[PDB]
C-alpha cells in the first residue's frame, strides 16, 4: 500500500534527506562530486503501508528538489523501517526545470 503525496516543510529533517541523497549519489559517480546546498519547496512525501489488511505504516517515500553545486536535482528517497539500511536513494536526476 501507499498513500498520496503530501507537502512537507523544508526544515532540518528534510534538509538531512537532501544531504543523504547527495552523499549516496556521490558514491556512484556518474556526475562529478556534488556539494549539498539546500532542499527547496516543494518537498513531498507519501506514506507506505504493509501490503495486508492491517495496513500499518511500513515507511515513507520522498520526492525532493535539491540544490547541489548550484544545480537543481530531483531526488527520490525510500525509507523502509523493516529492513536495514532503511534509507535508499531510488533516483537522482538533473539538472531539472525549477518548480
Amino acid at each position: 500500500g501507499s498513500g498520496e503525496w503530501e507537502i512537507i516543510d523544508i526544515g532540518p529533517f528534510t534538509q538531512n534527506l537532501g544531504k543523504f541523497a547527495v552523499d549516496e549519489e556521490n558514491k556512484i559517480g556518474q556526475y562529478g562530486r556534488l556539494t549539498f546546498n539546500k532542499v527547496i519547496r516543494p518537498s513531498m512525501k507519501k506514506t507506505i503501508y504493509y501490503a495486508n489488511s492491517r495496513g500499518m505504516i511500513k515507511g515513507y517515500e520522498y520526492q525532493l528538489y535539491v540544490y547541489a553545486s548550484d544545480k537543481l536535482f530531483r531526488a527520490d528517497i525510500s525509507e523502509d523501517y523493516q529492513h536495514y539500511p532503511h534509507r535508499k536513494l531510488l533516483r537522482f536526476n538533473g539538472p531539472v526545470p525549477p518548480p
Partner: protein, 228 residues
C-alpha cells in the same frame, strides 16, 4: 511497600547489554535510556554494535526491566521487581516462536551506582533459514499485551506465562510463547505477589540521524488485576 521502591520515585538511567547467538549468528546490542516508574514509562534506544542485526528488532523487545512498571498504590505490596533492588534479580526465559526456533535468555537486572542495568545473554536455535525470524518477515511495530504474574515461593521469586503477538508482513500474526522465571540475587526479604498482571504497550521507531542498525522504544507498563 519496600525500601527498593524508593529507588524508583524519579527518573532512573538505564543501560542494557546483550550478547546473542542465533543459529550461530553472533551479535551484540547496547541500549541506553531512562525509566520513570511513577508513570510506568520507559524510553530506550538500542544499537547493534556488530553490524546488521540477524533477527528482527521486535523479537528482542521483551528481552531488552519490569521494575519500571507502575504499580497502583493499592497494589504496591505486590511489586516483586522493585523490592529485589538494589541487589537485583535474575530473569530467565524460554521464548518459543510458533513453528520456528526458540530463544533462551538469562539476564541480571540490578543497580550499578545510580544506573539500572540489564545484562543479557541470549541463545537461539532451530530457526528456519527463511522463516519469519531469520527471513526478516516481521512488521516493524509492536502489540499491547497482558502479562500474568504469579508467586514462586520455593525460588523466593515469581514466574510468568504469556504470548507475544508479532505482526507478519503477509497479514498473519506469529505467536511467541514466553515462559519466565525471576529470582532475587540478594538474600534479603522480597515481596511475593498475589496473582496479577502487567498491562503493556510499546511503540517502535527509528532515529532519522542514526546510521547503525537500531531500535527506539517507548513503552508504558501498568499493573492491574487486583481489586482495591
Amino acid at each position: 511497600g519496600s525500601k527498593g521502591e524508593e529507588l524508583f520515585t524519579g527518573v532512573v538511567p538505564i543501560l542494557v547489554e546483550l550478547d546473542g547467538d542465533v543459529n550461530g549468528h553472533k551479535f551484540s546490542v547496547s541500549g541506553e535510556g531512562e525509566g520513570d516508574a511513577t508513570y510506568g514509562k520507559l524510553t530506550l534506544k538500542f544499537i547493534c554494535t556488530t553490524g546488521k542485526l540477524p533477527v528482527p528488532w521486535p523479537t528482542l523487545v521483551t528481552t531488552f526491566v519490569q521494575c519500571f512498571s507502575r504499580y497502583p498504590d493499592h497494589m504496591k505490596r505486590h511489586d516483586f521487581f522493585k523490592s529485589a533492588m538494589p541487589e537485583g534479580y535474575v530473569q530467565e526465559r524460554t521464548i518459543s516462536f510458533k513453528d520456528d526456533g526458540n530463544y533462551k535468555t538469562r539476564a541480571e537486572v540490578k543497580f550499578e551506582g545510580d544506573t539500572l542495568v540489564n545484562r543479557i545473554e541470549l541463545k537461539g536455535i532451530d530457526f528456519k533459514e527463511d522463516g519469519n525470524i531469520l527471513g526478516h518477515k516481521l512488521e516493524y511495530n509492536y502489540n499491547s499485551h497482558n502479562v500474568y504474574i504469579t508467586a514462586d515461593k520455593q525460588k523466593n521469586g515469581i514466574k510468568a506465562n504469556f504470548k507475544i503477538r508479532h505482526n507478519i508482513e503477509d497479514g498473519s500474526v506469529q505467536l511467541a510463547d514466553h515462559y519466565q522465571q525471576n529470582t532475587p540475587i540478594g538474600d534479603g526479604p522480597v515481596l511475593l505477589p498475589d496473582n496479577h498482571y502487567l498491562s503493556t504497550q510499546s511503540k517502535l521507531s527509528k532515529d532519522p540521524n542514526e546510521k547503525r542498525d537500531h531500535m527506539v522504544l517507548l513503552e508504558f507498563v501498568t499493573a492491574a488485576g487486583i481489586t482495591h
